[PDB]
Design goal:
Length: about 140
């Protein structure tokens, strides 16, 4: 679990969105596993605007942060799950690191701010949905 709070927006994994998220929907994309909803309280996370390939992510299954090198956002095949059929997920970045299903929502940050959130994993890999291209999160 986990979310990003920036201005009047809440960014979460689309497969973990709640009834309130869907009732206050701003935008969602199944191909990215992202959903953004509106909030009444003000958010203070800084979204990174960069091409960093190194950062730190929070891993709930270990109660620890880990430093990682990660790939550029791209289309990566993702095996079928209870939430989606087998498909290419876009804007996804991989890194060698530990992750378990409950780790989705953990934030990945670089020196510039929030880069994305955990969205996939397994086999000693962790995948992050990128948010750095969503320029509207800040305006
Ligand atoms: C495969 O299970 C893991 C593991 C592992 N091992 C480690 C981390 C996460 C998962 C779960 C995961 O990747 N899923 C299920 C929920 C939706 C995801 C998606 N974006 O399509 C795919
Ligand atoms: Zn950066």
């Amino acid at each position: 679990s986990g979310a990003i709070y920036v201005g009047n927006y809440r960014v979460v994994n689309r497969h973990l969105a709640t009834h309130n998220d869907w009732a206050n929907l701003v935008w969602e994309d199944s191909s990215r596993d992202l959903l953004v909803s509106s909030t009444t309280a003000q958010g203070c996370d800084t979204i990174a605007r960069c091409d960093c390939q190194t950062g730190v992510y929070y891993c709930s299954s270990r109660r620890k942060h880990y430093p990682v090198s990660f790939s550029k956002p791209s289309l990566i095949f993702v095996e079928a799950s209870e939430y989606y059929p087998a498909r290419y997920q876009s804007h996804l970045m991989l890194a060698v690191g530990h992750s378990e299903p409950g780790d989705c929502g953990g934030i990945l940050r670089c020196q510039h701010g929030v880069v994305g959130i955990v969205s996939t994993g397994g086999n000693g890999l962790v995948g992050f949905a990128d948010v750095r291209d969503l320029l509207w999160l800040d305006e």
